[PDB]
From Swiss-Prot, chain A:
The chain holds residues 51 to 99 of 445 of the full protein. The lineage of its organism: Bacteria, Bacillati, Actinomycetota, Actinomycetes, Mycobacteriales. Coiled coil: none annotated. Binds 2-aminothiazole antibiotics, which are antitubercular agents. The gene is atpFH. It comes from Mycolicibacterium smegmatis (strain ATCC 700084 / mc(2)155). It comes from the Bacteria. In the N-terminal section; belongs to the ATPase B chain family. In the C-terminal section; belongs to the ATPase delta chain family. F(1)F(0) ATP synthase produces ATP from ADP in the presence of a proton or sodium gradient. F-type ATPases consist of two structural domains, F(1) containing the extramembraneous catalytic core and F(0) containing the membrane proton channel, linked together by a central stalk and a peripheral stalk. During catalysis, ATP synthesis in the catalytic domain of F(1) is coupled via a rotary mechanism of the central stalk subunits to proton translocation. This fusion protein includes a component of the F(0) channel (subunit b) and of the F(1) subunit (subunit delta). Two copies of subunit b and one of delta together form the peripheral 'stator' stalk which links F(1) to F(0). This is ATP synthase subunit b-delta. It is found in: Cell membrane. F-type ATPases have 2 components, F(1) - the catalytic core - and F(0) - the membrane proton channel. F(1) has five subunits: alpha(3), beta(3), gamma(1), delta(1), epsilon(1). F(0) has three main subunits: a(1), b(2) and c(10-14). The alpha and beta chains form an alternating ring which encloses part of the gamma chain. F(1) is attached to F(0) by a central stalk formed by the gamma and epsilon chains, while a peripheral stalk is formed by the delta and b chains.
From Swiss-Prot, chain B:
This is ATP synthase subunit b. It is found in: Cell membrane. It comes from the Bacteria. The lineage of its organism: Bacteria, Bacillati, Actinomycetota, Actinomycetes, Mycobacteriales. Residues 7-33 are annotated as: Disordered. F(1)F(0) ATP synthase produces ATP from ADP in the presence of a proton or sodium gradient. F-type ATPases consist of two structural domains, F(1) containing the extramembraneous catalytic core and F(0) containing the membrane proton channel, linked together by a central stalk and a peripheral stalk. During catalysis, ATP synthesis in the catalytic domain of F(1) is coupled via a rotary mechanism of the central stalk subunits to proton translocation. Component of the F(0) channel, it forms part of the peripheral stalk, linking F(1) to F(0). Belongs to the ATPase B chain family. Residues 8-25 have a biased composition (Polar residues). F-type ATPases have 2 components, F(1) - the catalytic core - and F(0) - the membrane proton channel. F(1) has five subunits: alpha(3), beta(3), gamma(1), delta(1), epsilon(1). F(0) has three main subunits: a(1), b(2) and c(10-14). The alpha and beta chains form an alternating ring which encloses part of the gamma chain. F(1) is attached to F(0) by a central stalk formed by the gamma and epsilon chains, while a peripheral stalk is formed by the delta and b chains.
């Protein structure tokens, strides 16, 4: 029971760490997708000009 | 896209105005040119100058 409680604590800690890592990776993604879409917007605007 | 479309529409309107004025001036000049152009065209059609 002590080992299982420690396993649950470790699982929660690792879940927090993994969620933080996933959020950081997703923020970097969101940034890159936003940059790509902004470049596409510029290309479309210049084509129309 | 909307900003570029609006800018393009404004440029088209400004052209339709200024270029229309330019065309009016060029038409004024062509009005003087008509006499000589027609005279030479008739001369070529008939032959023997005139």
């Amino acid at each position: 029971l002590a080992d299982a409680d420690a396993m649950h604590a470790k699982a929660l800690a690792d879940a927090k760490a993994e969620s933080e890592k996933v959020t950081e990776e997703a923020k970097q993604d969101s940034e890159r997708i936003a940059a790509q879409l902004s470049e596409q917007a510029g290309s479309e605007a210049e084509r129309i000009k | 896209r909307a900003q570029a479309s609006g800018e393009v529409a404004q440029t088209l309107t400004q052209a339709d105005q200024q270029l229309s004025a330019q065309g009016d001036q060029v038409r004024s000049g062509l009005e003087s040119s008509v006499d000589g152009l027609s005279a030479k065209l008739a001369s070529r059609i008939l032959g023997v100058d005139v």
